[PDB]
C-alpha cells in the first residue's frame, strides 16, 4: 500500500536477525561487564525491530499537517530513538570507562536531540519544525564533541559518520524540506538504522573490547 | 456508571491502603539496603494508587475502535505497568544481588512487554492486537526465563504465577478475544494488580531478607 | 498574540542564557563529581529552555475543556519539570550524599507529582482537577519531608520556597480556581522557573560544594 512497507518490512527482518543473533551469542557470558555490553547491544535492535514493526502496519505514522497539505511522519521512530540512541552512547561511554558527568551529559544531551526531533517532526508550523532542527543538531555536536582503544575508536568514528547523516536526510527528506520522496528516506533511514544498530553491534560484540 | 467502577473504586483503596502500611512501617530503616527495597515496594502500590484513581474516574479510559466497533480501553494500566513492573524486577535483582548486565536486560525486556502491550491494546486493526501481544508474551518468557534466597524464591514464584496470569486475561479479555467482559477482567486485574503489588509488598517487607 | 509571550519569549532567553553560562563555566571540570553537579545544573535550563521555546510557539498548549469553556493549557511545562525536577533533586541528593533508598524514594515521589500535575491539568471533569492536585501536593510534602552543608542548606531552603509556590499558582491560576489570568500565571511561573533553575544554578555552581 505505502511505497516504502518493503524497507520498512526489509528493516523489521533485519532488526530482527539482528537481535536474535546477539540473544544467542549472548550465552556463554559469564563476565559482569560484557554482560552490560550484551545487554545493551541486543536491546537495541529488540527496540528497534518493534518500531520497524509498528512504522510496517499503520501504527506509528501520523499526517502531520504543514505547507497546506497533511504530511505522513513516522513518528514511531523517535520512540525508539529515544531509547536505542542512549545505550549506543552508554556501549562507548561503558567501553571507554566514562565518568557519571559525561554520562549523563552524553544522555541527557540525547534526549533534548532526539526530543527536539519529535517536535519538528511534529510542529504544524513549517517554519519552525527548521528552528527545532537546529536545536537538535547542535545537542548533536555536543555529543559528537564528547565523543579497547582501537574498537572504541572504530566505534566512535562509525557513530560520528552514521548519526550526521541523520540530520541530513530529516532535512531534505519528507520531513523537511521535502525534496527527497519518503521513499528513499525510509530506505536511507533503514540503511543508517541497520548500520549504527545491527554494524554496530557486530563491530562491538565480535571485538576484544 | 460503569459496572467496573466498583473494581476501580476496590482497587484504588486497596492500593491506597497498601501504600501507605509500607510508608509507616517505612519509618524506623537507617539500613541502606532496606530503604532500597523500602523505597520500591512503596512506590509501586503508589503509581499504582493514582492510575486506579485515573480508570476510577474517567481519565485512563478510551474507545479504541476494531472489530466495527469502538472498544473501551484502559490505557492508564500501561502507565502504571510501565514504572511498577521494572520496579518488581528491581525488588529480586536487588535481592538476589543481580548484576548491571541482568537488571538492565531485565528492565529493558520489561520495558518492551509493556511497550508492545499497549500498542497491541490500541492497534485498531483487529488481528495485530494479537501479533503485538505474541511479542510482548515472548518478552516475558524472556523475563521469567532470566528469573534470602527462601524469601528470593517464594517471590520469585510469586512473580512467575501472577504475572502468566496477565497476558491471559489480556487474550481473553475486552482487550483481546472479547469472550470475557470488561467487568471480569478489571476484578481479575485489581486481583493481579493488588496480589503482585500488595502481596508481593508484604511478603517482602514482612520478611528478614 | 497570545499576551503571556513576552513572558514565554522572556523565560526562553533566560533559560537560553542560563544554559550557555553553564555550558562555558563547564570547561575546566576534571573533578568527576563536578562534572557530575555540571551536568545536572546545565542540563535543566538546557530542556528547560526547549519547553519555554514550546510554548512560546504554539506547540506546548492545549484547550482542555472544562466548565463550559475551552481552556489553554500549557502541557509543555510537565513535559519539563517531568525532567528538570528530579535532577534538581538529583543536585541536593548528590551534594549531601543521599543514600540509594533516599534518591530513588525523592525521585519516584517527584515523578507522580508531576505526573499527577498533568493529569489534574488535562482531567476534564473541573472538580477532579483539585482531586490530583491534592495528591501531586501530598507528594511535595513529602519531597520538602526528606529534604557543603552551608551550600546544601541554603539550596534545600531555596528549592523549599520556591516550590511550594507552584501548587498556589496551579490552584489560583487558569489551571485551578482560574482567578488569576494566564498572563501573571506565565509570569509567576517564568520567575519560579529562573529562580529554581538559574539561580538555583548560580548559587550551586559558584559555590565550593
Ligand atoms: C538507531 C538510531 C540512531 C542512532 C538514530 C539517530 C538519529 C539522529 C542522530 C537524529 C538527529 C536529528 C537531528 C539532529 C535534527 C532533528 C531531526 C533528527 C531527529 C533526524
Ligand atoms: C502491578 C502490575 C504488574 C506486575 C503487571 C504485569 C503485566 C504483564 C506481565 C502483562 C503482559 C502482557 C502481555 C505479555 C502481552 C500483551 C498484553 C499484556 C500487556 C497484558
Ligand atoms: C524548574 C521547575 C520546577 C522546580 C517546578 C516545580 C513544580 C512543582 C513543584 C509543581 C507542583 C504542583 C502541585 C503540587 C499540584 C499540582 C500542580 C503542580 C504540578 C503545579
Chains 1, 2, 3 share one sequence.
Do not use: C
Not at 556463554?28 to 527496540?47: E, M, Q, R
Not at 566514562?98 to 552524553?106: H, V
Not at 559518520?161 to 524540506?177: F, H, K, M, N, T
Amino acid at each position: 500500500g505505502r511505497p516504502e512497507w518493503i524497507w520498512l518490512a526489509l528493516g523489521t527482518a533485519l532488526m530482527g536477525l539482528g537481535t536474535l543473533y546477539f540473544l544467542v551469542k549472548g550465552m556463554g557470558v559469564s563476565d559482569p561487564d560484557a554482560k552490560k555490553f550484551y545487554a545493551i547491544t541486543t536491546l537495541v535492535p529488540a527496540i528497534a525491530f518493534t518500531m520497524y514493526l509498528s512504522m510496517l502496519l499503520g501504527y506509528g505514522l501520523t499526517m502531520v499537517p504543514f505547507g497546506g497539505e497533511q504530511n505522513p511522519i513516522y513518528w514511531a521512530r523517535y520512540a525508539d530513538w529515544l531509547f536505542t540512541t542512549p545505550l549506543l552512547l552508554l556501549d562507548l561511554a561503558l567501553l571507554v570507562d566514562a565518568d557519571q558527568g559525561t554520562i549523563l551529559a552524553l544522555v541527557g544531551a540525547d534526549g533534548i536531540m532526539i526530543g527536539t526531533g519529535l517536535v519538528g517532526a511534529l510542529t504544524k508550523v513549517y517554519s519552525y519544525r527548521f528552528v527545532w532542527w537546529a536545536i537538535s543538531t547542535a545537542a548533536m555536536l555536543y555529543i559528537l564533541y564528547v565523543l579497547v582503544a582501537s574498537t572504541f575508536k572504530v566505534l566512535r568514528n562509525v557513530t560520528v559518520v552514521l548519526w550526521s547523516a541523520y540530520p541530513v536526510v530529516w532535512l531534505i527528506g519528507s520531513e523537511g524540506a521535502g525534496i527527497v520522496p519518503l521513499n528513499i528516506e525510509t530506505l536511507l533511514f533503514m540503511v543508517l538504522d541497520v548500520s549504527a544498530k545491527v554494524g554496530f553491534g557486530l563491530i562491538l560484540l565480535r571485538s576484544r573490547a
